[PDB]
Design a protein around this nucleic acid. Structure first.
Ligand SMILES: [Mg+2]
Ligand SMILES: [Mg+2]
Ligand SMILES: [Mg+2]
Lengths: 214, 132, 136, 149, 66, 115, 102
RNA sequence: CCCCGAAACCCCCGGGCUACACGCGCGCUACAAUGGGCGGGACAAUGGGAUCCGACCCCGAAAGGGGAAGGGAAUCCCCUAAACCCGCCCCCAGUUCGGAUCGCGGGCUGCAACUCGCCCGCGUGAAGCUGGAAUCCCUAGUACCCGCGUGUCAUCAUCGCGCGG
């Protein structure tokens, strides 16, 4: 950054990025509470070490999961905003340093706004962006019915983070707004639970489709 | 002149740290950690220091020579080397356990290496394949 | 004051009010490199905007364009070095440029060379293949 | 204080500004023209790029010692857009760095080992370390964890 | 935002389900509301371990299967 | 009226090979400075004689890589295209070109319908 | 006293070891100071052919490899030692080279 | 086995296999800000080298040119990689995106560069603003992204085999 103290920021306290603490952070959804890691972890970066196991994601910090979802490249095999995005070389895939700075600028943004811990804001956003029921087709005696099902909290997290990031991506695509700004907007919008957020909207639609399916 | 040598490895990156009594100066290839330009690399290297605390760092001086692959690998190898240096300088197992529960790979190494590339579109990867 | 949303440089090729070097690339025969050269030799700021250009500055870069090498431009940075009728190394602008292209082309045609033939048939002539990827 | 103690880019710009006060650091007549390499696409957009470049070279010779023009060429090179074709690395031109080194040998900052390239002189390392200690102070108003060093 | 959802703790995994194997039938026990101990069998999507907590928009559906 | 590089054809003739080369483009200059092949030299001396003498014959050749010169002007050369010796009456404005540029090998395509 | 480098290279670690043991036991038979069999990086000549003549079918490759193990031994140059290390058998699949540092 | 057998054998010159109204496969570059340019700052590994690598010096705007230490290979060289970071311009548009095409000139290889090579500089400034139906690859240091080496090689790498980030 252009302040030289943000450029050579030195950590001292083991806050997250040496800037934001998590002791004051609380998650009121009990199904997500175990699966949301909020340890005093200075650097979110893990080096893949969790994926080889089945719930290392549970053991993994949450802002790390965010930046990893932000290392995105848009949507290649699906259509967010009705559009394939397909950034190929000008993406952030495998660029976690860029992703880290994107997330950090987003947090700084919202905290300039929102007068709140941005991690608190983020947990609120995934909470009210995370669905509870989905639908899937099951066979009973050989005949398929699009039944409704409940969603496991890990999968709820996965969806929430994914579609937060995807909304940010669609809003930053081919327009004047930055990825960080789109991300900030998406998180606070979802936390306020307004439909402007792609993520809240998507949660509501899969949920109303489920409550239609049963 | 009590000095202690430690070493760290992270995928084609080798750091050699020497630790001794001093003031708190810690240098990576003649350069202060304070000014290492990617924040992430700085933070990888600093984690053991923050975690161990100023109380002992301020009496320690460290110098790391790292001669390998990438900035991140170098940072991790340095992190390893200085973590081991602190532990072997202090003989504090409460600190060893603090590190081992924060990140075990801080003291044990990451054993991972790159998988050899295999024929079909070998330049891309061992499993990356041509299109049908 | 001294503002102009539009400016004529080298006739009435008329240029916006962005920074001057790119405004000049708005001319045929001028890229950003030749532009930066011309301005550096004429003492003008390239980052400057065109609205604040004075008529004498206009005249100055116009005369440079008229005879670049005489002003400090090298001979290896020009549209038309070692011309086919005067060994002078010169830089050509819009109309003289299309005319020069036309002339060398139809010279080749007059002598019925491969390039002239391939020009008049509108096909590639710089070694390409044309089988799979030249389809119009 | 020293070069290794402070960062690079800030030092290069500061010592360039200071090198403008040296008379043996005139740009050559072909500077306002030419690119820095075939790997580039456009002329330098700055007017003092010559001083920035010789400052950089001076620091590089401080750090890497008996080094010459081909090594510096590969450091000042980089990636080229080769059109529709993929990207590759290309070295830079040698004339810029040669003229720079020669200007510096004139000013007294580098000398020329008969073999194995060029080497900074005491007056040269003094110059650089002076600028570095100055800079270190000005950013020790900031980081006292760097006052330490 | 958290509407009238009812927590439910997972006590036992049973066979997996789904045309493509993504679903897992499971036995769960409600924790709050009026049941406060009524086990029930639900078809849950995604990874589950025992001790997990799934929250339900209702409790009177009770899919059953072998 | 023709003026290759500010030089008229008389001057081009009275010139040597070195200076004409200096006037030529880089490729043809390189060809000359590297020197001619024996077949090229034999062709060239045939041409000298034909401007003089008569040579008692038309000039034929397989050499498509011989660059034209002012001496090779006012003359008709028959160049092999692979199948035929095709005639090339050499004007002043072929001055620094190869014979093959005027002797063509592949005839133009007039396509039939796909199938 | 001036020293003698013995660079020896083979495809068989056991022949190589045989030679080095010959040298060790002969130096200690005498008393001249050995410098160990320093093992140098072994050369892996790799040749990756396609194993098909036809050009048809899936492309499959044979990665053939030749390995050259290399040792060097420094021993002080005496006429005795030199005569007898010349007398050494030096089996067929090995090369040696006695340079002298002086 | 049949055939050619003084031609269907051998060698040389030239052309062609590089033609192009079109259909298809695999890929490269892009359609920009999850960026472009300029200047600065960083960090590799694998492999290879005798008429071969060539530091280092000088000349040149570049490509390149002259001389040349050392190196038959853990000694020397190829070899200070790019993606990344910092600052400054550009601020959502067929643009400071994109680089098809073409003109002029300057070079290297070679016996020969037109057909038909590769490189550099000035100039030009093509479609393309995310892509239907349908389809491919992939489970961890993997995929994606980044560049490098080598084989082919007189000169030619959007390829193959490999290397690391
Ligand atoms: Mg461009
Ligand atoms: Mg657009
Ligand atoms: Mg091939």
């Amino acid at each position: 950054a252009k302040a030289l103290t943000e450029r050579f920021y030195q950590p001292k306290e083991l806050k997250v990025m040496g800037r934001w603490s998590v002791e004051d952070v609380t998650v009121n959804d009990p199904s997500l509470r175990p699966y949301i890691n909020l340890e005093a972890r200075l650097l979110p970066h893990s080096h893949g070490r969790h994926a080889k196991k089945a719930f290392g994601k549970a053991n993994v910090h949450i802002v790390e999961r965010l930046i990893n979802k932000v290392m995105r490249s848009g949507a290649s095999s699906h259509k967010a905003g009705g559009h394939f995005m397909r950034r190929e070389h000008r993406s952030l895939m495998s660029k976690k340093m860029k992703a880290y700075e994107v997330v950090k600028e987003a947090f700084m943004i919202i905290e300039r706004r929102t007068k709140q811990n941005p991690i608190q804001v983020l947990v609120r956003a995934i909470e009210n962006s995370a669905p509870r029921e989905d639908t899937t087709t099951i066979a009973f005696g050989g005949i398929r019915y699009h039944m409704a099902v409940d969603v496991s909290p890990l999968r709820r997290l996965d969806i929430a983070l994914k579609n937060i990031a995807l909304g940010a991506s669609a809003k930053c695509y081919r327009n004047k707004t930055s990825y960080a700004q789109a991300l900030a907007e998406e998180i606070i919008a979802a936390a306020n639970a307004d439909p402007k957020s792609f993520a809240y909207s998507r949660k509501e639609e899969i949920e109303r489709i489920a409550q239609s399916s049963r | 002149m009590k000095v202690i040598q430690t070493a760290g490895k992270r995928k084609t990156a080798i750091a050699r740290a020497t630790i001794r009594e001093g003031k708190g100066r810690v240098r990576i290839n003649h350069r202060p950690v304070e000014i290492i330009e990617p924040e992430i690399a700085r933070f990888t290297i600093m984690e053991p220091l923050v975690l161990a605390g100023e109380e002992i760092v301020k009496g320690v001086d460290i110098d790391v020579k790292v001669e390998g692959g990438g900035f991140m690998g170098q940072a991790e190898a340095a992190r390893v080397a200085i973590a081991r240096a602190l532990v072997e300088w202090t003989n504090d197992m409460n600190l060893k356990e603090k590190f081992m529960k924060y990140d075990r790979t801080m003291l044990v190494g990451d054993s991972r290496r790159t998988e050899p590339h295999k024929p079909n579109r070998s330049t891309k990867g061992p499993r990356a394949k041509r299109q049908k | 004051d001294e503002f102009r949303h539009i400016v004529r440089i080298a006739g009435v090729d008329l240029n916006g009010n962005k920074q001057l070097r790119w405004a000049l690339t708005g001319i045929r025969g001028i890229g950003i490199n030749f532009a930066t050269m011309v301005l550096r030799v004429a003492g003008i700021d390239p980052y400057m905007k065109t609205g604040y250009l004075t008529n004498e500055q206009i005249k100055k870069i116009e005369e440079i364009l008229e005879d670049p090498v005489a002003h400090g431009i090298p001979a290896w940075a020009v549209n038309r070095p070692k011309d086919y009728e005067t060994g002078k190394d010169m830089h050509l602008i819009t109309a003289k440029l299309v005319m020069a292209w036309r002339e060398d082309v139809n010279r080749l045609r007059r002598v019925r060379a491969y390039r002239g033939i391939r020009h008049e048939l509108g096909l590639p002539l710089r070694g390409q293949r044309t089988r799979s990827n030249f389809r119009h | 204080a020293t070069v290794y103690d402070v960062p690079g880019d800030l030092l290069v710009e500061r010592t360039a500004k200071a090198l403008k006060e040296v008379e043996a650091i005139k740009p050559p007549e072909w500077a306002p023209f030419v690119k820095t390499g075939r790997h580039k696409e456009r002329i330098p957009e700055q007017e003092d790029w010559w001083y920035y470049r010789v400052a950089s070279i001076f620091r590089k010779i401080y750090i890497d010692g008996p080094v010459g023009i081909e090594r510096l060429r590969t450091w000042y090179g980089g990636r080229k857009n080769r059109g529709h074709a993929p990207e590759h690395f290309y070295k830079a031109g040698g004339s810029i760095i040669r003229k720079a080194l020669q200007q510096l040998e004139a000013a007294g900052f580098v000398q020329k080992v008969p073999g194995e390239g060029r080497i900074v002189t005491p007056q040269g390392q003094s110059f650089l370390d002076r600028i570095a200690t100055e800079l270190k102070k000005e950013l020790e108003e900031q980081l006292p964890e760097l006052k330490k060093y | 935002m958290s509407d009238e959802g009812y927590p439910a703790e997972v006590i036992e995994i049973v066979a997996r389900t789904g045309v493509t194997g993504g679903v897992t039938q499971v036995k769960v026990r409600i924790l709050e509301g009026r049941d406060k101990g009524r086990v029930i069998r639900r078809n849950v999507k995604g990874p589950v371990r025992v001790g997990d907590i799934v929250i339900l928009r209702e409790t009177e559906r009770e899919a059953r299967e072998i | 009226e023709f003026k290759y590089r500010g030089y008229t054809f008389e001057e081009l003739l009275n010139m040597s090979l070195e200076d004409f080369a200096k006037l030529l483009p880089s490729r043809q200059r390189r060809s000359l400075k590297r020197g001619l092949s024996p077949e090229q030299k034999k062709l060239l001396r045939k041409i000298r004689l034909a401007r003089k003498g008569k040579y008692k014959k038309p000039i034929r050749t397989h050499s498509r890589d011989m660059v034209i010169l002012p001496e090779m002007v006012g003359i008709t050369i028959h160049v092999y295209n692979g199948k035929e010796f095709v005639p090339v009456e050499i004007k002043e404005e072929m001055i620094g070109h190869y014979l093959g540029e005027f002797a063509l090998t592949r005839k133009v395509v007039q396509h039939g319908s796909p199938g | 006293m001036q020293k003698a480098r013995i660079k020896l290279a083979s495809t068989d670690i056991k022949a190589l070891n045989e030679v080095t043991d010959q040298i060790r036991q002969i130096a200690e038979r005498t008393g001249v100071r050995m410098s160990g069999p320093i093992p140098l990086p072994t050369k892996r000549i790799r040749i990756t052919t396609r194993k098909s003549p036809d050009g048809e079918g899936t492309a499959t490759f044979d990665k053939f490899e030749l390995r050259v193990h290399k040792r060097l031994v420094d021993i002080e140059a005496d006429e005795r030692a030199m005569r007898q290390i010349m007398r050494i058998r030096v089996p067929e699949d090995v090369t040696i080279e006695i340079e002298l540092i002086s």
